[PDB]
């Protein structure tokens, strides 16, 4: 099932020698094992513009770092990791 619990970014963003980007996220809540409610949005933080490469990101445990490869659009991108307002949100500008 999808997850209710808390998250956090364990490492800095590494953009590939081609285009893609990786995001390592953590599980600080209750519901392990579960699905990661990860997504990407617009400059408005409303319009869902982007590409999710990782097929159904898994949250096996609490001490779990989910490897997530993705392809945002050109310019500003606001990646949403958990569920709600206390959920992760982070800016990334594609040069």
């Amino acid at each position, epitope marked *: 099932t999808m997850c209710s619990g808390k998250f956090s970014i364990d490492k800095e963003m590494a953009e590939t020698q081609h285009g893609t980007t990786v995001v*390592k996220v953590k599980y*600080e809540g209750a519901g392990a094992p579960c699905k990661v409610p990860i997504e990407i949005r617009d400059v408005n933080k409303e319009k869902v513009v982007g590409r999710i490469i990782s097929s159904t990101p898994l949250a096996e445990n609490t001490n779990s770092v989910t490897n997530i490869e993705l392809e945002p659009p050109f310019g500003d991108s606001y990646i949403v990791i958990g569920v709600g307002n206390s959920a992760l949100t*982070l800016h990334w500008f594609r040069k």
Partner: single-chain antibody
Amino acid sequence: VQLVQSGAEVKKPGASVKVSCKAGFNIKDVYMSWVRQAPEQGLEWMGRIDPENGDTKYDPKLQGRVTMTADTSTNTAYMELRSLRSDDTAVYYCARGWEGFAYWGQGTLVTVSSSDIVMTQSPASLAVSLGQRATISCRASENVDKYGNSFMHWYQQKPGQPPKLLIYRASELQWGVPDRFSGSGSGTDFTLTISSLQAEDVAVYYCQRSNEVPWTFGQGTKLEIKR
């Protein structure tokens, strides 16, 4: 999970020490740090390792004397401090995390016997009455911003005990931490609040930046009950 460090060691000036840290998870996708604390002194970040590529970043003050290694096969992180001077007498902790350290080892005492961003915590000490609103400040010499986020964290430390993360990402409250602890601020000015002061809440509080290296800690604020 949790971190297990090697035992206490006595060393002679000029000597070298290597401390281990075994994690009950795969250290590959995390940042492993070493943090030091001289007796009756604040927390000092020593450096960090990315165990996937072996990248090391050290505090300029320890640069040249420290080597940090990490074996993903064993999930052990190592910290070699060479040319041990008398001032290197401290409790050494390994930790895991970028947005605050939610995992800490238990500590390892090392006994030695025969520009750059500034973190200002205010006050150095305060006393409030039980059930009364206590606030602590943390101004940073430069914007601790990364990805449109404030990389300002808050810790709590009771004597002889390892630190505990309370607030990460300037506002975010760590699991198992009471709701009276509020976190706020943006840019360079930040605040830690405590709604109703409980007797457990008597500890030293630290703020920490982690947007870019060094992930400097503040000097600490010793919170007490009004006598």
